[PDB]
Paper text:
The glucocorticoid and mineralocorticoid receptors (GR and MR) are paralogous hormone-regulated transcription factors that have served as useful models for studying protein evolution. GR and MR have a modular domain structure that includes a well-conserved DNA-binding domain (DBD) and a moderately conserved ligand-binding domain (LBD) – which binds the hormone, changes conformation, and attracts coactivator proteins that potentiate transcription of nearby target genes; they also contain poorly conserved hinge and N-terminal domains. The two paralogs descend by duplication from a single ancestral corticosteroid receptor (AncCR), which existed in an ancient jawed vertebrate ∼450 million years ago, before the divergence of bony vertebrates from cartilaginous fishes. We first resurrected the LBD of AncGR1 – the GR protein present in the common ancestor of bony and cartilaginous vertebrates and the earliest node after the GR-MR split – and then used functional assays, X-ray crystallography, site-directed mutagenesis, and computational predictions of biophysical parameters to dissect the mechanisms by which GR evolved.
To understand the structural basis of reduced GR sensitivity and identify other important substitutions, we purified AncGR1.1 expressed in E. coli and used X-ray crystallography to determine its atomic structure in complex with DOC at 1.95 Å resolution. AncGR1.1 adopts the classic steroid receptor active conformation, consisting of three helical layers, an internal ligand cavity bounded by helices 3, 5, 6, 7, and 10, well-defined ligand density within the cavity, and a surface for coactivator binding formed by helices H3, H5, and H12. The conformation of AncGR1.1 is very similar to the previously determined AncCR crystal structure, with a root mean square deviation (RMSD) in backbone atom position of only 0.66 Å, and most of the larger deviations are far from the ligand. The side chain identity of all residues within 4 Å of DOC are conserved except for A36G, which alters a ligand-contacting residue but has no discernible effect on hormone sensitivity. These results indicate that AncGR1.1′s reduced sensitivity to hormone must be due to indirect mechanisms not involving contacts with the ligand, such as changes to intraprotein contacts that affect the stability of the protein-hormone complex. In AncGR1.1, the smaller side chain of Ala43 loses its van der Waals contacts to Leu72, opening a small cavity in this region. The poor packing that results is expected to destabilize the receptor-ligand complex. In AncGR1.1, this hydrogen-bond network is much sparser, largely due to the replacement of Arg116 with His. The loss of favorable interactions presumably destabilizes these helices, the ligand pocket, and possibly the coactivator interface. It appears that Ser71 in Chain B of AncGR1.1 might stabilize the receptor through direct and water-mediated hydrogen bonds that a cysteine would not form.
Author numbering: -1 to 173, 180 to 247
């Protein structure tokens, strides 16, 4: 089987938030639901990541570190893709039972960040990103935020990352350098957006009582590790372009 076949085969099914739409929206309900969904998606992401060629050969500590650093990037990018594929206009397709319009983006109290995530879908539109390109790009996001002090299997990581860069190149050819330049530019743009998402995430995590935002155990585990590392500057982006 081809590398791209495996990527297609291991791509998770769509996840539901478990939202009751008969009950009115509130800020707390929306954010807590977003978090419950985030937690479910991350359980699936762990499963997905563990099945990735090459990546599955890294020491397990490296596997969980990369997933932990890249969590927000992966989910924002997948959101962008879902919103492109299943929706049109200013709408975010978080889940089949949790779709945001202008109202819901406003009431979430993270309106500007919703618009930032929406920009990803607009870029998928403009560039006409193929499914195969998207699958390759998503893996690159898993491999694009690393601890500043390095990984256990650094040389192996570099090799794995290069192979998926080559995979992206194959996805491009199927259908050149200009497209590579453009798609890697889109990857780089995730870092600034994710910075904004993380600022708000940490705020809601800390202010959760006074606000009243619920987080699942899955996200509590991630955030309690990521809050200190990100705030302490331990995460380094691996950029394709000059900053
Ligand atoms: C973490 C977060 C709720 C969960 C989402 C995240 C943005 C990206 C994202 C995409 C999804 O498809 C599932 C939810 C999620 C992971 C939001 C950024 C701010 C927001 C909060 O801080 C709510 O407390």
């Amino acid at each position: 089987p081809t590398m791209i076949s495996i990527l297609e085969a291991i791509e998770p099914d769509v996840i539901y938030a478990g939202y009751d739409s008969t009950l009115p929206d509130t800020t707390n309900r929306l954010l807590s639901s977003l978090n419950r969904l985030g937690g479910r998606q991350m359980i699936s992401a762990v499963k997905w990541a563990k099945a990735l060629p090459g990546f599955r050969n890294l020491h397990l500590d490296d596997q969980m570190t990369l997933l932990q650093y890249s969590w927000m990037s992966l989910m924002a990018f997948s959101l962008g893709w879902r919103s492109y594929q299943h929706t049109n206009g200013n709408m975010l397709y978080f889940a089949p039972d949790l779709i945001f319009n202008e109202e819901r983006m406003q009431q979430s109290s993270m309106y500007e960040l919703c618009k930032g995530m929406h920009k990803i879908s607009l870029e998928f539109v403009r560039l006409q990103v193929s499914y195969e390109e998207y699958l390759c790009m998503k893996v690159l996001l898993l491999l694009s935020t690393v601890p500043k002090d390095g990984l256990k299997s650094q040389a192996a990581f570099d090799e794995i990352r290069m192979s998926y860069i080559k995979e992206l190149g194959k996805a491009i050819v199927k259908r050149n350098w200009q497209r590579f330049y453009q798609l890697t530019k889109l990857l780089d743009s995730m870092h600034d957006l994710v910075g904004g998402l993380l600022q708000f995430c940490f705020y809601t995590f800390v202010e959760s009582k006074t606000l009243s935002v619920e987080f699942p155990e899955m996200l509590v585990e991630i955030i309690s590790n990521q809050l200190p590392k990100v705030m302490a500057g331990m995460a380094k982006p691996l950029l394709f372009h000059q900053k």
